Amino acid sequence: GADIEVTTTIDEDVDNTVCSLREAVELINKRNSSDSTVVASVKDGYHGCGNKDASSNIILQRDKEYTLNSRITITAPLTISTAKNDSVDTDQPGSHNATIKMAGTDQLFKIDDESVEKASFSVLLSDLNLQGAGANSKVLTGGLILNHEKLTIQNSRLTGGYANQGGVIYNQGFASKSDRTFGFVYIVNSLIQNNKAAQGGVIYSEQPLFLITQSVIRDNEVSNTSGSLFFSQDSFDDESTGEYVVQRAIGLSNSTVFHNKGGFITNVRDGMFVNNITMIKNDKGLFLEAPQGNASISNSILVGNTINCQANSTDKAIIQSNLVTTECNRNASVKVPNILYPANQKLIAGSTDEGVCDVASKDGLLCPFNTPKDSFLGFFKPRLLESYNTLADSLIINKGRLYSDGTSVGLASCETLDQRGKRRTGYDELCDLGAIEYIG
Amino acid sequence: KLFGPDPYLPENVQ
């Protein structure tokens, strides 16, 4: 039909009338091949997979678990998503997503054109459950995906990513030179859970080439206590890192990060940004190594961790308008200061970090983590502890604001949306610290 | 606006 519709849940490569996920990808690979003998071999489909429109969209059915016995190499631009039409669409979002699970010890995908100079293509993975080999993983690099192209993952679950480097994704590629073959990873509205690596617990990127937004990062580990979940191997060769940070294209935003183990969450280099995240109840938080001063951490909650922040002796990262302890207040601007966390201030309004919220508790900034029925990702809900006359003394609510200044002040500007996609400054002029805008 | 055009990446990344 219009799209390539997979008609089986088993990993097959047999010429017949049933189309598998592997044969669907290989159809798009052979279609984009340079050998006309290969392109002509798929002029009428491949081993059961086909579509009249001849686009590169692979459709998986809802609530189906698709099994892979080994990785699949993607060498052409394509999309893999779950069926859209409900065929009554009032269920919990994220449910009815197709599942791509590993039946052996290998990774799920490798995304690379296998050639030099050939500019990077694009790949979209939407509304999927990517489940790796977990403790059975023999993957060295990229427990779920080994990426060398421009990859965009949305509305997905990323679990089971076990490797030595890059639990979920090993992002390969260098961007500082004239090489456009780099890999970029953009993850939005997703759940990163139960992933482990010796370095790069979630993403191992050779350069700061990732952007995580509106996502939830929980229960992940990097075994090296000096490593990070979102690791950047090398830094940019002064490729105007100040230009990289004003665009806010590399880093973490509108994301809840908690219950992660081992090393830091990420190593902040020049060109990266952190805005409107809630980073609580982790082993280690942010490691700061921005020698040129072209990095911004703003509007975030950076408390409740065993080590909230740690810095290299030559770091000049800008920390503005955050709820931090003393060790993360690098003061930065006087016009955009940070909000220091009061000693002995209760953080969670409950007996656990996840569960029911003591809605009668006069103290406690955040409710315990909870996933609402109308949403796919949970969060720590902010609570109003101050009166209207004393709202200026609140540690979270109405403490951020849009600046649009162009200098260091603009780096502390609010995010337009929050983790749930709600507009922070649509109906007002201020925003609330953390990943969630206070709505009630 | 940064790493090149793309159908799925955000504008500030492009």
Residue numbers in the entry:
A (entry chain A): 2 to 88, 91 to 443
B (entry chain B): 1 to 14
Quote the study's own text:
We tested 20 or fewer designed macrocycles against each of four diverse proteins and obtained binders with medium to high affinity against all targets. X-ray structures for macrocycle-bound myeloid cell leukemia 1, γ-aminobutyric acid type A receptor-associated protein and RbtA complexes match closely with the computational models, with a Cα root-mean-square deviation < 1.5 Å to the design models. RFpeptides is not limited to generating macrocycles with particular motifs or topologies; the diffusion process generates macrocycles with diverse shapes and sizes and selects the topologies appropriate for the protein being targeted. Among the four targets tested here, binders for MCL1 and MDM2 have helical motifs, binders for GABARAP have a β-sheet topology and binders for RbtA sample looplike conformations that make extensive contacts with the flat surface of this target.
We designed macrocycles against Rhombotarget A (RbtA), a recently identified cell surface protein from the ESKAPE pathogen, Acinetobacter baumannii. On the basis of our preliminary design runs without hotspots to guide the diffusion, we identified a patch in the N-terminal domain to pursue in our large-scale design calculations against this target and defined hotspots Leu144, Phe202, Phe204, Tyr206, Val208, Leu231 and Ala269 for peptide backbone generation. In contrast to the concave pockets targeted for MDM2 and MCL1, this selected patch for RbtA is considerably flatter and difficult to target with conventional computational and experimental approaches. On the basis of further binding experiments with SPR, we determined the dissociation constant (Kd) of the best binder, RBB_D10, to be 9.4 nM. To confirm the structures of RbtA and RBB_D10 and the binding mode between them, we determined the high-resolution X-ray crystal structure of apo and macrocycle-bound RbtA using X-ray crystallography at 2 Å and 2.6 Å resolution, respectively. Together, these data highlight the high accuracy and success rates provided by RFpeptides even while designing macrocycles against targets without deep pockets or targets with no known structures.
